[PDB]
Design a protein around this ligand. Sequence first.
Ligand SMILES: [Ca+2]
Ligand SMILES: [Ca+2]
Ligand SMILES: [Ca+2]
Ligand SMILES: [Ca+2]
Ligand SMILES: [Mn+2]
Ligand SMILES: [Mn+2]
Ligand SMILES: [Mn+2]
Ligand SMILES: [Mn+2]
Lengths: 249, 239, 249, 239
Amino acid sequence: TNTDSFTFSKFKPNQPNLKKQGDATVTSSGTLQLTKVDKNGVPDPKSLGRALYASPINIWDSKTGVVASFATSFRFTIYAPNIATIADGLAFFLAPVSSPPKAGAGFLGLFDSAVFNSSYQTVAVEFDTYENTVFLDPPDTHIGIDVNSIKSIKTVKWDLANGEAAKVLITYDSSAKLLVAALVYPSSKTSFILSDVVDLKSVLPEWVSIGFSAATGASSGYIETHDVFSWSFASKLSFLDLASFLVAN
Amino acid sequence: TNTDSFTFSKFKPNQPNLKKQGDATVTSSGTLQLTKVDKNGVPDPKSLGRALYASPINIWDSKTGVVASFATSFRFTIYAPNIATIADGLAFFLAPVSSPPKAGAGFLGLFDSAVFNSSYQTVAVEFDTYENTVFLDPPDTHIGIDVNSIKSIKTVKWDLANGEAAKVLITYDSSAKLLVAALVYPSSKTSFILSDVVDLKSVLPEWVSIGFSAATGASSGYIETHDVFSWSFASKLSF
Amino acid sequence: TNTDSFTFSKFKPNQPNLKKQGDATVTSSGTLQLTKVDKNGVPDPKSLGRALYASPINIWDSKTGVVASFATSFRFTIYAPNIATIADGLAFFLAPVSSPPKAGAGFLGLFDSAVFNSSYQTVAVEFDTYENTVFLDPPDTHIGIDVNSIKSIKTVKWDLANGEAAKVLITYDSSAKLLVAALVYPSSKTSFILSDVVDLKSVLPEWVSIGFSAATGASSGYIETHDVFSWSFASKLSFLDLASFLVAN
Amino acid sequence: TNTDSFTFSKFKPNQPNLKKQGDATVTSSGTLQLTKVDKNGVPDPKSLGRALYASPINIWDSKTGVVASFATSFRFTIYAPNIATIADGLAFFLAPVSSPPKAGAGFLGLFDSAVFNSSYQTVAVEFDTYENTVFLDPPDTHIGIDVNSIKSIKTVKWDLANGEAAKVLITYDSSAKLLVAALVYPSSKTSFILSDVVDLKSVLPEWVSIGFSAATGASSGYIETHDVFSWSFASKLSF
Ligand SMILES: [Ca+2]
Ligand SMILES: [Ca+2]
Ligand SMILES: [Ca+2]
Ligand SMILES: [Ca+2]
Ligand SMILES: [Mn+2]
Ligand SMILES: [Mn+2]
Ligand SMILES: [Mn+2]
Ligand SMILES: [Mn+2]
């Protein structure tokens, strides 16, 4: 059984098990800021950021044809100084070693254009903040499942609680092939969930890097932070003590 | 760090680490039937069943004041032979060691009447399949958080996928004091979630037994299966 | 798969998940005094104490023939007022739900006489401070593995370090059938390890309780404490991740 | 809490989470050969191999000054065609990231001479098959704890069981500073163990890579394999 795991309960200015791409920084205070935030905490336009774990994960194996199970939770904050105008969102993702940032804004760092392409080999769960009709975005802000796509194969409503902290759990069960993303604001006591069957074995290579990508608006005023506070991950490729995972890590 | 954990990937005819109460039984196939189901797989009216883990869990500590965190998941099936006439529900609960089954039907074996009583010292997440006006049940089948009372302090719509297996995750963060219940049908790809602040240190004794309880209707014809296939649990209480 | 586990970093005056047998008691400061100790700290002779976890463990399965892996650690101190006359020992055991305390002294509450008996259905790792030649005890304080007999199937020297805390790790691999007992004294930086093949399936029942058992001497002045400060246990019975267990406990 | 962990119960011809240096090969059967071996399985002399996990581990933190606890387990086999001529052994180590292979032979790719140098920032537990009197090696094959020097600060006897697989548990306790290496041979039932107080935080950088280094003999015929079947690692550095 091939296993992979880490917990970051805070992040650090010196974090060599994390590869920063784009504008991503870790502040002195230990917030991973995925996207550009000026000195008075004001988010900034035309930004793009990704942060992925130093090490590859073996997500499926072609000798056995077996597909890994995984669990990730993380805690993040989106702050808008002006909630009427916000863009573009953040995503948790899986992609090949060594994927680089694609186009920004509503492509969220993971894709290059509206269309589907098997070469992306990216799946991500997006937390999508600005409606792009071009991508068949729903009118409400929404959690989204993207598989080589940016046009989510499934979405649901997600009401941003401005400047408030969100706890996420994302979960993938190899035998059901079920993907589930939970989102909770302990402050507002509101909650959101989504699930779909998605076949990791057709869309991802055997090895993958995982992490976060975020973009802000391409038109100033349309602005927000994408600050991540802590991040936990575990994958298992057999041939996932999950109650034990949530509670511990 | 007082920790307490178990996993049952299936249930066994012989098993001393579960206390069955009421009609609860384990089929030869390793299914935990909380509720009576005859020889052809037909739910029976007026049943009540509970199962809990043999050993008490230290849930909070009066001397330190600190309160445990926990998580539990389980996969369960509800079968109705007629989906238009169904009752009453199942629930995961925490209750004092000794807790015995109470009134059945809409009380789900956890309560005695509709009123709030601090003496229950019971917190439950109910999956409630039949509207009791008198408990202010919503006019849909729902997930509910019950704190010393069958009248939930919170609820959300739950749409029942009949006879399909449901996967539950129930989560309690002691720093936040946040209870979260999630339910997914892998078969249907539907999904449901509810959250609320609940102060366990006020409502539960330091020690509890944890488990399931479930009941079927009193009017015959208001009947459903309440089967648990697997259950894992973990709790952590710090010093 | 069927698994069960628990951790006591301290013991509490009220502890319903521990059945206390004989003299076993939990002090106000949280020690599990297995054998009797007055208010000055003096260990008292003719004592028998056993403590075990409230809930039964499924350690093997007939319909399947699979055997549990397991792993347990604990921290215990033995204090002796006169280093030179000490007795009789303490033991970690697996026995039936629900075993009761057998004979005290050199039998350590787990056995009645010197002979092996099928019906005991008791496997114990023993920390043995007094030579009973009747039992084929060696001339030195020792660790030994007891399979239905107090005549240990195997032993190794164990130099007791008076009133110092000993850390134990006991490990069972059902694949290899290998049982391993290890003991360390962080203070004195000393260490001792024993291993052997034992077959649990053909010795234990499908269901056991596990815990500790201790005796002091029959001859007075032949005394010592048996204090347990901390304990954790984890078992796995297939239809452990040993490393991450020894880091959580 | 910063936490880091991985399990390889198999090695794979494509293994991107492992950086392999010198002669290190993963074979088609999923064995990590630290040291060079022909198609017939005969080890070769003048070989040096290391393998470490791709991603750095934070073992201590200066701002708080706390040190990681960690635990690692692995199975390895050493086979010698002539047990009377064997060299030089293997080691699990922590060193700086970007650390590279040193002098081979009985330096075990880990040091360059017989001399304590605070700059190595290298802690190793070695399983040493050849007596280097130059390094203060005892007259028996041994397990040794190497803190910044191949001249072990403490060792103990270890009886090599030719071509048989060994199980190792190496543990570290940040609060006791206690370092423990256990080795067991399932087939033989032999057992060995060593422990000592080590101060990681004066010796190691805040960040390290961890893995295995091995070496065969710098003389004709002083040869043995150094094969690794499986490896897991867990580290926890408190906040
Ligand atoms: Ca969008
Ligand atoms: Ca109801
Ligand atoms: Ca004796
Ligand atoms: Ca040497
Ligand atoms: Mn979208
Ligand atoms: Mn209700
Ligand atoms: Mn003995
Ligand atoms: Mn040496």
